[PDB]
Design a protein around this ligand. Structure first.
Ligand code: HEM
Ligand code: HEM
Lengths: 145, 145
């Protein structure tokens, strides 16, 4: 249950999420694109899912990829802001899931985002403790896929 | 031309958008639902598009509608944040348009949101000047549909 997954977000976990987000979320365009480019670099098999974005090897220059990356970051902004109210977190996550389910993105495939997140966090000096916190947020979405 | 539409967002317009957003964007759940329920009240012919959300007449009590409403507000948050850079505003508007286009939403359809926005702003003591500012932002989206 998505609700059961949201239970893993204890006070300490929510604290690390907000603290780290104040930094990585402060530069959505730069960090969002870093996330996507890292995803494609370490998981080439996922490139096929994003054919609508054109040539993703163009990075920042690709306007479609840039728009997707910035938008992706606002979905994370949404999750972070609903952390204190499980009911709101759950309804936003379930809607979010709808389109990813239609695209046939399994819970395991979605989990591939953990790698890129860990690296982006590391680039800002946020270690394993923070990566584990983020993996728990991602697990909430996985519970809905 | 989406670019020409975005060029209509002058200094005064951007300032008015930010000032009003400071208030309405502070309660995304409340004002998001208000915007959707006003839309369904003023333009019943649009309800058919949200069939997946169940009984939208339930407003806040409808989990799916609440989830959609909160998420809608983050798209607006996204647009407001890109006001400093037209290139970034345009690229996010174009990705946003993609799903609405797939849903066959035309520019004539999308413009119906101007009424509800004007009413929500008014409920928060924001008059004509602000309603006109937001109409210009909506115009950017319409130009991409
Ligand atoms: C932190 C995790 C992620 C977030 C916050 C995120 C967010 C989003 C958002 C906001 C959209 C745009 C709205 C829509 O659904 O149409 C989207 C689209 C999409 N996402 Fe995710 N996503 C994430 C991870 C992934 C992963 C891991 C995959 C697959 C490997 C994936 C595949 C897709 C695809 C195929 C689209 C459609 C792009 C297009 O062709 O327009 N997403 N995602
Ligand atoms: C300021 C105006 C609006 C904003 C900011 C907005 C925002 C959004 C967002 C963020 C989504 C979720 C992501 C996606 O699936 O693309 C969405 C979905 C949707 N929008 Fe829009 N939208 C607006 C107006 C409208 C209007 C006027 C219509 C129709 C007349 C419309 C119809 C839809 C539909 C059918 C969905 C899918 C809902 C669901 O099944 O969960 N939108 N919109």
């Amino acid at each position: 249950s998505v609700y059961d997954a949201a239970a893993q977000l204890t006070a300490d976990v929510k604290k690390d999420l907000r603290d780290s987000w104040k930094v990585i979320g402060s530069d959505k365009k730069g960090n969002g694109v870093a996330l996507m480019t890292t995803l494609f670099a370490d998981n080439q098999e996922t490139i096929g899912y994003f054919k609508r974005l054109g040539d993703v090897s163009q990075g920042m220059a690709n306007d479609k990829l840039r728009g997707h990356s910035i938008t992706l970051m606002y979905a994370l902004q949404n999750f972070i802001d609903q952390l204190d109210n499980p009911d709101d977190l759950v309804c936003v996550v379930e809607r979010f899931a709808v389109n990813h389910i239609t695209r046939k993105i399994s819970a395991a495939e979605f989990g591939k985002i953990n790698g890129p997140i860990k690296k982006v966090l590391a680039s800002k000096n946020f270690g394993d403790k923070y990566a584990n916190a983020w993996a728990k947020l991602v697990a909430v979405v996985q519970a809905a896929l």
